[PDB]
Amino acid sequence: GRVIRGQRKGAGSVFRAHVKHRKGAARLRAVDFAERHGYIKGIVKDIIHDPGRGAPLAKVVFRDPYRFKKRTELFIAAEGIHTGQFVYCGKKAQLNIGNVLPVGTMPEGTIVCCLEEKPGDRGKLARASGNYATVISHNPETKKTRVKLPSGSKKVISSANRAVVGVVAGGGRIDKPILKAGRAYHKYKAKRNCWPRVRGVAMNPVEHPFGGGNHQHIGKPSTIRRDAPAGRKVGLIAARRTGRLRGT
């Protein structure tokens, strides 16, 4: 046989991200003395569309505490922030929408977005449009907090991780039918070469496990074991179940 489309995606080539017109990487501030002890003020200059991303991005500007400079930060835009607004990042920032605080100081039930997976990494979790994480509980003795991720999983993270109060803007995006193959063509022309997708049963056996046959049938169980070799791991990968999810 030949290498299947899934295998070919990992080699880069025509399968790399379309990053020509993106505005940069959306991150929190790099943690420094100001955010470790107090807070720093910043002003929202612009809220911009980022190609390939549902959520808008905020362009916040801070004062450099050591030099005569202005620092431009590219934050994830929490819903409700506006241009000209003051945002504050640090340990002693106040619990307002758009402020960046360590999750340790946030009370139980706080809604956050752009939450650091590890302390200092500048924000990794709950960055998709409309999403957020909640704060469940703190363990001051071990300095660790329990949060609920948008997928529903619960995670124990360091209390020192920073995060933005509120939910990511641009929510409810998936509530609109696309209605058109052309509109889906434009959605992915800004992201990557993944569209349109050709079904496995519609290929020949040479380039897919499901291909071939005088009838368009899978011919083998579609739940494939977790340890299947690359080029064989297609279909429902390591599925715990199949069918309609009935109930909770």
Under the criterion CB under 7 A, does residue 146 sit at the interface with RNA? no
Partner whose footprint covers residue 69, from RNA, Mg ion, none (CB < 5 to 8 Å by kind): RNA
Who contacts 246 (Cβ-Cβ below 8 Å, separation ≥6)? none
Under the criterion CB under 5 A, does residue 1 sit at the interface with Mg ion? yes
Under the criterion CB under 5 A, does residue 65 sit at the interface with Mg ion? no
Separation of CA 172 from chain center: 15
- Pair type for strands 236-237 and 223-224: parallel
d(CA 150, CA 173): 16
Stretch (H or E) spanning 62: strand 57-63
Binding mask 195-234 for Mg ion (x = CB under 5 A): ----------x-----------------------------
Tell me if 45 sits within 8 A of 59, measured CB to CB: yes
Determine how many CB atoms are found less than 10 A away from the CB of residue 210.
20
- Pair type for strands 162-165 and 154-158: unpaired
Q: Indicate the DSSP class of residue 33.
A: H
Q: Which is nearer to Mg ion, 1 or 80 (CB)?
A: 1
Residue selected from 112, 125, 134, 139 as contacting RNA according to rule CB under 7 A: 125
Q: Indicate the DSSP class of residue 180.
A: -
Under the criterion CB under 7 A, does residue 109 sit at the interface with RNA? no
Under the criterion CB under 7 A, does residue 221 sit at the interface with RNA? yes
Under the criterion CB under 7 A, does residue 247 sit at the interface with RNA? no
Please list every residue from 3 through 62 that binds RNA, using CB under 7 A: 3-27, 30-34, 36-41, 43, 45-46, 49, 51-55
Instruction: Tell the smallest beta-carbon distance from residue 217 to RNA (Å).
Output: 3
Under the criterion CB under 7 A, does residue 80 sit at the interface with RNA? no
* Count of residues in contact with RNA, rule CB under 7 A: 159
Q: Which is nearer to RNA, 108 or 117 (CB)?
A: 117
Under the criterion CB under 5 A, does residue 6 sit at the interface with Mg ion? no
Query: Residue number with the shortest CB distance to Mg ion?
Result: 1
Tell me if 138 sits within 8 A of 104, measured CB to CB: yes
Instruction: Tell the smallest beta-carbon distance from residue 75 to RNA (Å).
Output: 11
Among 84, 10, 104, 7, residue whose Cα is nearest residue 41: 84
- Interface with Mg ion by CB under 5 A: which residues? 1, 205
